[PDB]
Ligand binder design. Structure first.
Ligand code: DGD
Ligand code: CLA
Ligand code: CLA
Ligand code: CLA
Ligand code: CLA
Ligand code: CLA
Ligand code: CLA
Ligand code: CLA
Ligand code: LMG
Ligand code: LMG
Ligand code: SF4
Lengths: 97, 143, 80, 31, 75, 42, 154, 93, 66
């Protein structure tokens, strides 16, 4: 259901409440820890992060390498937090390489 | 404001065996392009026109007949390898013209020294009907 | 020379810029969005009319439009 | 003296030659 | 260097799980379809094993057993 | 079993079974009342 | 009669066709054993052909100069069996099909993953729905009168 | 240009763009002067563009006109004409 | 005082160059920022031809419906 989500960030690391049926980035905005975004539709690198523990559903994914899914990277805008996962923010370029 | 690098002839070029995809008469009479990169080591890379060549450890300067071919080779060099490149356009005059990256930073990265060219401050659904620009030389989009 | 226009619905994703084969587009500062960025077309004399940029635009409708126009030898992508 | 014997070659052979030479000359160089 | 029979035991368990799921091999297909184009893609890339994965071993195992299926059809 | 029931209801198999049943029905109907150009009962 | 055609039972070309048809099959029956499988099969189809011609004659079809039973669709009541009663039957069956399909589409439109129930049929729901087609005409009439058959808002 | 590995130099673009002539001779006239003096004296009046074109077109035109307006029957059966009585059509003729 | 329709609303689209024109969608977020010409963000239940299901709109292009 509403598992706690941890996000490392240059601002620090905060915890927010959000139901497994919603994207981590969408409820983050409801609380108010600012994150980057652009398209909001899963087709760009702007909202990129990677994970420390757990894993998010890859069903809400597109315009990604046939590897970015299992090598760590993910999109905050298009992702369902199936567990009490710990993710990274501001992770576009070390993804952009 | 980012004095562009000047082309340095005597810079070697990759080890190639020759191809029928190289330059033609257009390079003789109108223009051709030249790309340069710096090659941490001597390696094999696919030529944007033919087969495979070997980039030398040290300066590499390659002459192509199309700007699009240059950008293709540049993209391949930039993300498959990690190599910074620049290319120029040469005329039959002996003029060279630094082309890319124009202001030192790649265009996918916003730079505070660039002006807006061809930007319309409205949504695409608010162009006038063609009847409104009939018999005047303007195009409804150029407005 | 084809004519490329950028409209204010641009979200400044920059996917189109990363798509163009001939380095026609660019990213420039702006204030109308959350990226403070918008696409410019300062070098349309090199545009081949490929319209890859339009297939990369995630807006609806598009924010980058390519109107094919008078042809040059640069526009026709001719190596001879 | 047979009028076709003259006009069918001239209009079928000469005239297209002259017209096409002239039109190529006109279309294929700069003013 | 020398040549021998070299096998792997039970790499994939026979099951009806993936029959219920249309286009299990393609990540995008597996999730489900938004338009009519998804149905056409499901068939167009059914036997393109070298794009469902990148492992040569898996490609070749699939190829071997598909050949067996074809021989059965011929018989 | 549950998954076999699911797969047997996927669109191609559902439609082939439906159309085979329909074909059987029409075939038998025309096997009993053959060469029918009209409705002669009422 | 209607359109200058004549009752096949009293036509001559219609009979001539029947006799000619029957004639060729009889030839196929010959050159084999009199009571063989193939011969028995040929006999069967001969009797079938005779039954078809007599059935055509009995039903009162109209025959032209070629002896072929023409069909009248103008609405003449002597000929409703040719087009109009089969037409009503077809309209009933097709409305059945379409109404059941529409009923199903409406019923599955409310899930989160409605496409899942379109590439993989919910057969229990479908079997619950199939038999409403039986009353589809009344249901559709009352839906039109209600104003809920056609989507407003579009 | 061509200093071991380099092949690009702004000073000599033609060498860089391969503006060579791979087969030109750069040799003297192989024809003996006497022979040269015979030709360029007799073939001179045909080396003016407009003159040669106009004369060619009109001369060849009247050539064809004369040779076809005055061709004999054994050259073209079209001018020999028919030599047989004609048949009748399916009903007309 | 916030701007535009509230989050989660049901708004009808009025931009005639949009795929979902005269259709309906659900509001996701309307930035309180001025200086943005298209603050409203709307999610739809159907992809467009580019396989995209969310889009930004201006306050006048949306119209809250029932
Ligand atoms: C000769 C002169 C006299 C004639 C008298 C004629 C009467 C009508 C004909 C037959 C009557 C007996 C039918 C068989 C007995 C059990 C039928 C039944 O109760 O079986 C159960 C269903 C229940 O019908 C309705 O079913 C609807 C939907 O339920 C379900 O409908 C489906 C049923 O599988 C699915 O389960 C679906 O998910 C679910 O929505 C309604 O919401 C109600 O629940 C219920 O009233 O009846 C059904 O239609 C079963 C399917 C057959 C229906 C036949 C109707 C007549 C034709
Ligand atoms: C559009 C009308 C027309 C058409 C289709 C033809 C067609 C034909 N004519 Mg003819 N002709 C015409 C008008 C026409 N004529 C007129 C008005 C005259 C003067 C009375 C003649 C006098 C004439 C003669 C003496 C002969 C023919 C002959 C022929 C046949 C051979 C082709 C040829 O030599 O060209 C025609 C030759 C000409 C000298 C025609 C010149 C006169 C016309 C007006 C020239 C028009 C040119 C104009 C600038 C272009 C018009 C644009 C358009 C047609 C494309 C051919 C079937 C030959 C024949 O009998 O074949 C067996 C033949 O010897 N014609
Ligand atoms: C449309 C007008 C036209 C006319 C009037 C002719 C006329 C003729 N054609 Mg012909 N031809 C035409 C169109 C025409 N052609 C087209 C469109 C095609 C393409 C399919 C051909 C393909 C064709 C073939 C393959 C051949 C002919 C041949 C011939 C000649 C056969 C008759 C003969 O034996 O006489 C006399 C025979 C001669 C050789 C007399 C020579 C003709 C004169 C003397 C040449 C002098 C012309 C002058 C110097 C200038 C040249 C043209 C100038 C006005 C621009 C004849 C003079 C046959 C031929 O003879 O080969 C040349 C033959 O092999 N034609
Ligand atoms: C193209 C012109 C034309 C048209 C439109 C018609 C039309 C018709 N002709 Mg006519 N005819 C024509 C030309 C035409 N004719 C010509 C040129 C001739 C001279 C050769 C004739 C000679 C002729 C004769 C001699 C007769 C007709 C008759 C008829 C009627 C028969 C059908 C009927 O009775 O109603 C309909 C029949 C029903 C049983 C009604 C049931 C249909 C249901 C209600 C609709 C089904 C819909 C669905 C299943 C349920 C509803 C769903 C909904 C609520 C959502 C019909 C209205 C016959 C007549 O007079 O009618 C009594 C007849 O005797 N015609
Ligand atoms: C799925 C639709 C369908 C339907 C509605 C029917 C219906 C019927 N079939 Mg049939 N059949 C079908 C499909 C179907 N079949 C298929 C797919 C095949 C395989 C080719 C057959 C092969 C078949 C054979 C071989 C025979 C029938 C026979 C019959 C009739 C039964 C008569 C009887 O034996 O005495 C009455 C039965 C009861 C009173 C109970 C009947 C009306 C039999 C028949 O008509 O006899 C000649 C018969 O012999 N069927
Ligand atoms: C729209 C085109 C069309 C139409 C209107 C028809 C119409 C007809 N065809 Mg034909 N046919 C067609 C296309 C068409 N066909 C094509 C494309 C082919 C090539 C494959 C054929 C090949 C073909 C053959 C081989 C035969 C027919 C036959 C028939 C007749 C059979 C009637 C019947 O089945 O009894 C009545 C059936 C019913 C009443 C079933 C409905 C009852 C339901 C199930 C119950 C409802 C309860 C309430 C009928 C008049 C048969 C015939 O005898 O010709 C006269 C036959 O032999 N057709
Ligand atoms: C064996 C004979 C035969 C065969 C094989 C067909 C086959 C076909 N017919 Mg057809 N038809 C026939 C006889 C036949 N017909 C006869 C005798 C009549 C005279 C009544 C008609 C009148 C008829 C009509 C008016 C139509 C067809 C249509 C069709 C096609 C689609 C049917 C369908 O969509 O299913 C299921 C039905 C649906 C998915 C949608 C429902 C549409 C049907 C007609 C129900 C309509 C109900 C409504 C209340 C009545 C409207 C009245 C009408 C005048 C507008 C199909 C290929 C349809 C077509 O051609 O498509 C362009 C079409 O509209 N037929
Ligand atoms: C729920 C099923 C359904 C219904 C009720 C309708 C109804 C209608 N259709 Mg449509 N259609 C359907 C399915 C359906 N269609 C499918 C699957 C296709 C893809 C081939 C089409 C393609 C189609 C076209 C191209 C057109 C229509 C048109 C129309 C309208 C005129 C009638 C007609 O000509 O139909 C024609 C019928 C067909 C072309 C084929 C029908 C396919 C089968 C018979 C229906 C499928 C039933 C479903 C699979 C059963 C599931 C039930 C559940 C228990 C499993 C009418 C409102 C016409 C229109 O626009 O009207 C102005 C028109 O041009 N339809
Ligand atoms: C054909 C019938 C298939 C039956 C079936 O698949 O269900 C039976 C099971 C699926 O059923 C599953 O079984 C599991 C243990 O095998 C667990 O008990 C699960 O709880 C049970 O759902 O699949 C099979 O065993 C069939 C194997 C392949 C047979 C061909
Ligand atoms: C038999 C063949 C003919 C059948 C004619 C049946 C009646 C047709 C006229 C009535 C149609 C109708 O009531 O709905 C008419 C439908 C709309 O239906 C209307 O919906 C409204 C809002 O829900 C109200 O419920 C009205 O009562 C209802 O009539 O639209 C039309 O068909 C336009 C015609 C004028 C109405
Ligand atoms: S048409 Fe092609 S070259 Fe021109 S801007 Fe678009 S993608 Fe770039």
């Amino acid at each position: 259901a509403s598992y706690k989500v941890k996000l490392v960030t240059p601002d620090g690391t905060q915890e927010f409440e959000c139901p497994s049926d919603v994207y981590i980035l969408d409820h983050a905005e409801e609380v108010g820890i600012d994150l980057p975004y652009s398209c909001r539709a899963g087709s760009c690198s702007s909202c990129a992060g990677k994970v420390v523990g757990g894993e998010v559903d890859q069903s809400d994914g597109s315009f990604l390498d046939d590897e970015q899914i299992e090598a760590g990277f993910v999109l905050t805008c298009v992702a369902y937090p199936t567990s009490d996962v710990v993710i990274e923010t501001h992770k576009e370029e070390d993804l952009t390489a | 404001g980012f004095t562009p690098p000047e082309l340095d002839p005597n810079t070697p070029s990759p080890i190639f065996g020759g191809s029928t995809g190289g330059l033609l008469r257009k390079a003789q009479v109108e223009e051709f392009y030249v790309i340069t990169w710096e090659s941490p080591k001597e390696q094999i890379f696919e030529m944007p026109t033919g087969g495979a060549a070997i980039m030398r450890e040290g300066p590499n300067l390659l002459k192509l007949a199309r700007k699009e071919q240059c950008l293709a080779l540049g993209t391949r060099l930039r993300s498959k390898y990690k190599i910074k490149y620049q290319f120029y356009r040469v005329f039959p005059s002996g003029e060279v013209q630094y082309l890319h990256p124009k202001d030192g930073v790649y265009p996918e990265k916003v730079n505070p020294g660039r002006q807006g060219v061809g930007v319309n401050f409205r949504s695409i659904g608010k162009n006038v009907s063609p009847i409104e620009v009939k018999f005047t030389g303007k195009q409804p989009y150029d407005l | 020379s084809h004519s490329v226009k950028i409209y204010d619905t641009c979200i400044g994703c920059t996917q189109c810029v990363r798509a163009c084969p001939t380095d026609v587009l660019e990213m420039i500062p702006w204030g109308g969005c959350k990226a403070k960025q918008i696409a410019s077309a300062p070098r349309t004399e090199d545009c081949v009319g490929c319209k890859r940029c339009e297939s990369a635009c995630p807006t609806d409708f598009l924010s980058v439009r390519v109107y094919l126009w008078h042809e040059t030898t640069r526009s026709m992508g001719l190596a001879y | 003296i047979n009028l076709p014997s003259l006009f069918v070659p001239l209009v079928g052979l000469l005239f297209p030659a002259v017209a096409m030479a002239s039109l190529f000359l006109h279309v294929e160089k700069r003013l | 260097p020398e040549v021998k029979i070299l096998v792997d035991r039970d790499p994939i368990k026979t099951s009806f799980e993936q029959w219920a799921k249309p286009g299990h091999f393609s990540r995008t297909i597996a999730k489900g379809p938004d338009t009519t184009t998804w149905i056409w893609n499901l068939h167009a890339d059914a036997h393109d094993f070298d794009s469902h994965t990148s492992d040569l071993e898996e490609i070749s195992r699939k190829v071997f057993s598909a050949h067996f299926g074809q021989l059965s059809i011929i018989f | 079993m549950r998954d076999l029931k699911t797969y047997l209801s996927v669109a191609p198999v559902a439609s082939t079974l439906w159309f085979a049943a329909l074909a059987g029905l029409l075939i038998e109907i025309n096997r009993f009342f053959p060469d029918a150009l009209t409705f002669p009962f009422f | 009669d209607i359109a200058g055609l004549t009752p096949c039972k009293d036509s001559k070309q219609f009979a001539k066709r029947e006799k000619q048809s029957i004639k060729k099959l009889e030839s196929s029956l010959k050159l084999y054993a009199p009571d063989s499988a193939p011969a028995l099969a040929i006999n069967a189809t001969i009797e079938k052909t005779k039954r078809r011609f007599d059935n055509y004659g009995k039903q009162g079809l109209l025959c032209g100069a070629d002896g072929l039973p023409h069909l009248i669709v103008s609405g003449d009541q002597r000929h409703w069996g040719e087009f109009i009663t089969p037409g009503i039957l077809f309209l009933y069956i097709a409305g059945w099909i379409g109404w059941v399909g529409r009923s199903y589409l409406i019923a599955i439109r409310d899930d989160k993953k409605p496409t899942q129930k379109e590439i993989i049929i919910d057969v229990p729901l479908a079997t619950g729905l199939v038999f409403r087609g039986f009353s589809w005409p009344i249901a559709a009439y009352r839906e039109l009168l209600n104003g809920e058959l056609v989507a407003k808002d579009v | 240009y061509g200093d071991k590995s380099v092949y690009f130099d702004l000073e000599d673009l033609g060498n860089t763009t391969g503006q060579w002539d791979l087969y030109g001779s750069d040799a003297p006239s192989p024809y003996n002067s006497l022979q040269s003096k015979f030709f360029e004296t007799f073939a001179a009046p045909f080396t003016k563009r407009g003159l040669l074109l106009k004369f060619l077109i009109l001369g060849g035109g009247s050539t064809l006109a004369y040779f076809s307006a005055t061709a004999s029957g054994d050259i073209l059966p079209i001018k020999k004409g028919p030599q047989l009585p004609p048949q009748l059509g399916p009903r007309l003729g | 005082p916030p701007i535009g329709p509230k989050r989660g609303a049901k708004v009808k689209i009025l931009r005639q160059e949009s795929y979902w024109y005269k259709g309906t969608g659900s509001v996701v977020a309307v930035d309180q920022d001025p200086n943005t010409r298209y603050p409203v963000v709307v999610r739809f239940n159907k992809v467009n031809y580019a396989n995209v299901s969310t889009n930004n709109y201006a306050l006048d292009e949306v119209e809250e419906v029932k």
